[PDB]
Design a protein around this nucleic acid. Structure first.
Lengths: 79, 154, 98, 48, 138, 54, 157
RNA sequence: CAACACGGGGAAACUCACUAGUUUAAGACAUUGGAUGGUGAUGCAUGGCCGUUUUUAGUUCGUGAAUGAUUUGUCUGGUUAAUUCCGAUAACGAACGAGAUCUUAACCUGCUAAUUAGCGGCGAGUACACUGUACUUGCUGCUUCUUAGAGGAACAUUGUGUGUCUAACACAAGGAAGUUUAAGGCAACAACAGGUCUGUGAUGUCCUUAGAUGAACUAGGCUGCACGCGUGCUACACUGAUAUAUAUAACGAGUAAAAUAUGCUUGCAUACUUUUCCUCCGCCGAAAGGCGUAGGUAAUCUUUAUCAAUAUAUAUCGUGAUGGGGAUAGAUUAUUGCAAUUAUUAAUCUUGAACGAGGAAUGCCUAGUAAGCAUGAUUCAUCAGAUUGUGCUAACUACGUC
């Protein structure tokens, strides 16, 4: 099956909220991720959704994305 | 040529008095006379490098190779198997490609080295690595060097 | 004490300063031994697509190693080296006799 | 997926993920077209 | 006791050590005899003959040679022998005699006194040689 | 061989402000030129000393 | 541990990765290089590891993005560089210039040496890509500043 | 020209864009619109970067002067590496390029230095025959050599010719060096519709985007072969091959998976320890190679105060496609890898082709070059007949002219 990764998505949002920034590899082909348990595909999909909804700003360099969290994302996660 | 009118004082006691080749051939003849070593078995079918593609042509070769090994041992007391392989190394004809260097046959070298150790003229040092000559080995080489030095003199 | 940098001027400057520093606390030093230069050598074709002429250039990243060593207790040499440093010089201390 | 712990698809440029022309000398994984841009900032000087 | 001087052709360097002695001449682990080619032996015996061996029998010589091939090394040795003869005659014998001796050597050739100046020109792209090119075509 | 306008420019300034300082010898002129003028390279300073001597 | 050759090159790669990242962000004032607004930059870098030519070029590309006429914008930027004490400057804009046939325009003033080690030491350069809807224009700013010691003088009182 | 061992493009897979076919959502955002990715189309839309023009010597401004475009400066002449200088000169003053300038190498340091380099000094032996010579094991003022900093040294120095007798050239002497000491790096003005969007998250437009021209997987293909052209290698032999022997060098380069263990039925499930790159050394192997282990983040260990091959010596052919030569082919045992077959690569024996010094043509080269001989590095899971470096053996012939 395709699967919907709700537990991973929720955990990534918690991580995002706590930090205020996230620095990770752009690619989703490699599964293993070293700085948090969830595979890279989960992080890429969720960050893409967040970027379109504009909770996060991209700066980018050399296939790393350099995402800074906006104030509206902080308000959403807390409640 | 064979006898020389040198402008300096020679040592008259050691391996650098005598010509290297004359020493090797003469000492090899002495080793054969003595009956110091044998092939053994597998060493009958050798070629020194792979690309030689003939038996060693001069017939007295095994004793010559042994003698050549003994001269190198007097020079360097830190030797191991890889040193012998490199020492006796040559070029290998690659046919329709240029030549490249190739190490000499290692089993016959190992056989001579080990057999000489068993016959007491060389000794493995495991600390400060490598086979050297024994003092008995050195004395025999020096005695032979003096004998040859005497023969060139008279 | 071993001094490494890829910065030529900074290693050279620090060496004179640590020697000067050593005589201040009257330490017994051997004169500075400049160790063989290590070069990161890259031979690069100039054409980016490899089209046209076979133009090659040779790039060098040259790293400097130097040694100055001391017959002293550990505490004086470590404290003196630690205060005197400049940021691009990477320093390691080597222990010696009493 | 197929084994890629050896062979051409195991390796790519750090800067741009190129599938050819990678300089693996000194184990930094950069393609020559990238490398000429960055060699001064990495530290390299030219003399020949 | 001891004085040192030297020779330098291409990569090769020969340092010659001239001691007070009895007429022994050595090359690292070897007697002076063991050069091998008759031609290049004759070249290093040449300055010894030009002075005469009865003027060299109060000194022992040992030489240490590193670098280069045989032809380059023998010229470095001949320079090292030349300078060795000269340094002994300046340090032990007599400076005026050394100048006189140096003149005889120098008139014969400057090559023992002043080494070869030739050094390799480095390879460039587009050919096997330094200046030489791979074949052009149309 | 031949010497450039810059080499000549320094040499021309010399004599004009240092007429009686100079001597026939090249080595002393090298010292005088070095004393009077700050020339950044030895080769360049020697060339100027040379031309001033000429 | 790793060799000195590996260590210093890996440091170089990290410095390179940081410098290009900084150069892509760059706005108000020139970046300072590695430490051996700031809160956000620091936090990203810690996470990863656990007037000048570039500014003038970036300013000029910003004016180009704003759609201003090339001659006035380039002269203004060139003037500020010369006025602020440059001994030469050269500015090139390449590409469409809002036309269907690509071209370039050079704006140089002062001495602007190209030769020997004074050029390499004292001329600072910056390249910038300016995106429009007809594609991309290349700005090149070069500034000469020798103001260690000057290349030409005969040095008499 | 400035294509054609060029695309760092040394393709079993991966690679790859192709072919035979098979899959997938990793389709943001609010059926559906909407966009996201694309070694897709377009270098005759473009950015970058590079080749050429041209590595020769050229270029421009200020002011002045001479329907105007324009010209002068920026030149009769001398001289030169050179728009380099002099010199004359409606111009006088400039700037760029040239030169200077950076990296080596050359020489000299009674100065700067001794570690992970050497030397002496001295204990200990084994030989020689000593109140020295030779050779190995133990300990520890000298810096010449090894290393690497700073500083010196050539300026046409001196003499003599030729020269506006200026700029400068020629010869000799001196000298480490005389042509700017030798070699590179370096790279104006202005172009070319030169090449590259098959390197880029540089990029317009156009194509494409769910029985995808994206990502991915399985084969096959890039190398097939009547035939034509590049570029190299190996050859055509006695100034040589064959077998033994002597001599010797410089640049380098060296960190997420395997092994071992447990439970179950090669297979499945789990743990844990280290294998990982260079290989000394010690055994075993004709040979490739195998096994056991050591030392190395490196001037230290691999290993380089000794790692090479042509050289050169004694032997064997005795000149006959010959024992030159290794095409072409068969049987092997190995090594790498999932897979080795369209000989992967390796060795052993056997198989023993053409080639009798090359037409018309045409390449490179003036001093350690040219040529010959090797060898490190690059790609690399696996491999040099390639490129790029590095050493050694060390020529000829002008030394000028259009």
């Amino acid at each position: 099956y395709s699967y919907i990764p709700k537990q991973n998505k929720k955990l990534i949002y918690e991580y995002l909220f706590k930090e205020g920034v996230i620095v990770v590899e752009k690619d989703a082909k490699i599964p293993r991720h070293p700085h948090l348990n969830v595979p890279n595909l989960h992080i890429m999909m969720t960050l893409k959704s967040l970027k379109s909804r504009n909770y996060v700003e991209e700066k980018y360099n050399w296939k790393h994305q350099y995402f800074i969290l906006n104030n509206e994302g902080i308000e959403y996660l807390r409640e | 040529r064979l006898l020389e009118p040198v402008p300096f004082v020679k040592t008259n006691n050691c391996i650098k008095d005598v010509d290297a080749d004359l020493f090797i051939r003469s000492y090899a003849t002495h080793l054969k006379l003595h009956n110091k070593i044998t092939y053994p078995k597998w060493c009958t079918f050798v070629k020194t490098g792979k690309g030689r593609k003939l038996a060693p042509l001069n017939e007295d070769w095994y004793f010559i190779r042994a003698s050549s090994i003994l001269r190198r041992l007097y020079l360097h007391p830190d030797i191991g198997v890889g040193f012998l392989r490199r020492q006796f190394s040559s070029k290998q004809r690659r046919g329709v490609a240029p030549n490249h260097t190739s190490l000499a046959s290692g089993k016959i070298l190992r056989s001579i080295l080990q057999q000489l150790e068993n016959l007491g003229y060389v000794e493995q040092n495991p600390k400060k690595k490598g086979r050297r000559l024994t003092t008995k080995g050195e004395n025999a080489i020096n005695n032979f060097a003096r004998y040859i030095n005497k023969k060139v003199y008279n | 004490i071993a001094l490494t940098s890829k910065n030529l001027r900074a290693i050279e400057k620090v060496c004179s300063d640590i020697m000067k520093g050593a005589k201040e606390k009257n330490l017994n030093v051997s004169g500075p031994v400049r160790l063989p230069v290590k070069t990161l050598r890259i031979t690069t074709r100039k054409s980016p697509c490899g089209e046209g002429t076979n133009t090659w250039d040779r790039f060098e990243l040259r790293i400097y190693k130097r040694l100055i060593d001391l017959y002293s207790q550990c505490e004086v040499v470590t404290q003196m080296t630690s205060i005197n440093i400049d940021p691009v010089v990477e320093v390691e201390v080597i222990i010696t006799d009493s | 997926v197929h084994p890629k712990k050896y062979g051409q698809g195991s390796r790519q440029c750090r800067v741009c993920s190129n599938k050819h022309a990678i300089i693996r000398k000194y184990n930094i994984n950069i393609c020559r077209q990238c490398f000429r841009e960055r060699a001064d900032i990495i530290g390299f000087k030219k003399y020949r | 006791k001891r004085v040192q001087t030297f020779g330098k052709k291409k990569t090769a360097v020969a340092v010659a050590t001239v001691t007070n002695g009895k007429g022994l001449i050595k090359l690292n682990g070897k007697n002076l005899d063991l050069v091998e080619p008759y031609i290049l032996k004759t070249k290093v015996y040449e300055p010894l003959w030009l002075i005469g061996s009865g003027k060299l029998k109060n000194l022992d010589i040992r030489i240490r040679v590193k670098g280069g091939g045989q032809t380059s090394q023998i010229y470095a040795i001949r320079q090292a022998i030349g300078k060795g003869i000269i340094s002994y005659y300046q340090k032990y014998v007599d400076e005026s005699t050394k100048k006189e001796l140096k003149d005889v050597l120098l008139r014969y050739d400057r090559s023992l006194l002043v080494g070869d100046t030739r050094r390799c020109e480095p390879k460039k792209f587009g050919g096997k040689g330094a200046r030489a090119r791979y074949q052009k075509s149309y | 061989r031949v010497r450039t306008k810059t080499i000549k420019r320094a040499a021309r300034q010399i004599v004009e402000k240092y007429y009686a300082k100079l001597t026939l010898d090249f080595q002393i002129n090298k010292k005088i030129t070095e004393e009077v003028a700050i020339i950044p390279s030895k080769r360049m300073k020697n060339k100027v000393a040379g031309f001033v001597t000429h | 541990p790793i060799s000195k050759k590996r260590k210093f090159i890996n440091d170089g790669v990290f410095q390179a990765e940081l410098n290009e990242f900084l150069a892509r962000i760059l706005a108000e004032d020139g970046y300072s290089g590695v430490e051996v607004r700031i809160r956000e930059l620091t936090s990203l870098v810690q996470k990863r590891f656990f007037l000048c030519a570039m500014a003038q070029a970036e300013s000029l590309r910003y004016k180009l993005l704003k759609g201003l006429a090339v001659r006035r914008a380039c002269y203004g930027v060139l003037r500020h560089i010369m006025e602020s004490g440059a001994k030469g400057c050269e500015v090139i804009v390449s590409g469409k210039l809002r036309a269907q046939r690509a071209k370039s325009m050079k704006f140089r003033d002062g001495y602007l040496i190209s030769t020997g080690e004074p050029s390499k030491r004292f001329v600072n350069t910056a390249t910038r890509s300016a995106q429009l809807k007809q594609g991309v224009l290349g700005i090149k700013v070069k500034i000469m500043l020798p103001t260690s010691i000057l290349p030409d003088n005969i040095s008499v009182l």
